Amino acid sequence: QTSAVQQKLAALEKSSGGRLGVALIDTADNTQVLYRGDERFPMCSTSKVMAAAAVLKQSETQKQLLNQPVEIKPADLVNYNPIAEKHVNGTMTLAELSAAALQYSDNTAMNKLIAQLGGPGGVTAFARAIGDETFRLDRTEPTLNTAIPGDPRDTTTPRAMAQTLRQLTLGHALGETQRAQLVTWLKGNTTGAASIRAGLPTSWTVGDKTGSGDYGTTNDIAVIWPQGRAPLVLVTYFTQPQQNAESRRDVLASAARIIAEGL
């Protein structure tokens, strides 16, 4: 079947010229709304949530792990390092790296999280351990954002990412203190006001993680606390056929607005 919401999302996608993927979980009733929910999309920096969460899981058995200093060398800097560049020839703790990766989208910080987990496959292994059979991280920053159409590397589906984001932030994939820390970090994101949040009523509270890459790829994954009702989890992924396409955060906002109107 095609619902009214799905037909609106299809119209939005048609006008946009690109390929749109949406997954909503409404935790009030556990119902789901999907659009291309089982197609693969490049995650780009939305993958930083999985890396930070994997380190939070490690910290459940190491009380001092988040305070461990990690060296930042000049050679570690990649292509977007607003926080890590201030620490070159010094150190950042794993908490600081997690916060920088999540709230500023720092790519050097992400690479330190990946290294702490033993490489991209350590992030995938954590995903499997929490029941996500779809997520795959194959590369480090910045090349995990190449976003080439048809490339399976560094992709997931909207359905899988919404389920995982729910388990991480609202369910029991992490210990209680770690879940709360992840939610605090997401709610303090600096990069998200033009994405999912721009399509929602202003009274609603949002924590989110954005992503973008080549092929005009523009992504956001969010946990949403609407005024007076149980939380929602929403994934909006968007990618375009030409390498040099411009970012389209407005398409994510428009998808979120359609979703909110259908509640």
| Beta-carbon contacts of residue 67 (< 8 Å; ≥ 6 apart) | 93, 94, 95
Smallest distance from the beta carbon of 197 to ligand MZV, in angstroms? 13
Smallest distance from the beta carbon of 102 to ligand MZV, in angstroms? 10
- Kindly state the helix (H) or strand (E) to which residue 209 belongs, with its residue range: strand 205-213
Residue type, 129: A
Q: Report how far residue 94's alpha carbon sits from residue 68's, in angstroms, rounded to the nearest whole number.
A: 6
The residue (of 59 and 145) whose beta carbon lies closer to ligand MZV is 145
Q: Are 65 and 58 in contact (CB under 8 A)?
A: yes
Q: Are 156 and 41 in contact (CB under 8 A)?
A: yes
Q: Does 254 bind ligand MZV (CB under 6 A)?
A: no
Q: Are 183 and 223 in contact (CB under 8 A)?
A: yes
Choices 55-63, 115-123, 137-145, 155-163; region in contact with ligand MZV by CB under 6 A: 137-145
Smallest distance from the beta carbon of 263 to ligand MZV, in angstroms? 26
47 is catalytic: no
Q: Does 140 bind ligand MZV (CB under 6 A)?
A: no
Smallest distance from the beta carbon of 163 to ligand MZV, in angstroms? 22
Q: Does 155 bind ligand MZV (CB under 6 A)?
A: no
The single residue among 35, 80, 135, 237 that binds ligand MZV, judged by CB under 6 A, is 80
Count Cβ neighbours within 10 Å for each residue of 23-33 and write b for 16 or more, e otherwise.
bbbbbeeeeeb
Q: Considering only residues 186-225, where is the footprint of ligand MZV by CB under 6 A?
A: 191, 210-214
Q: Does 142 bind ligand MZV (CB under 6 A)?
A: yes
- Kindly state the helix (H) or strand (E) to which residue 25 belongs, with its residue range: strand 19-26
Q: Which residues are catalytic?
A: 45
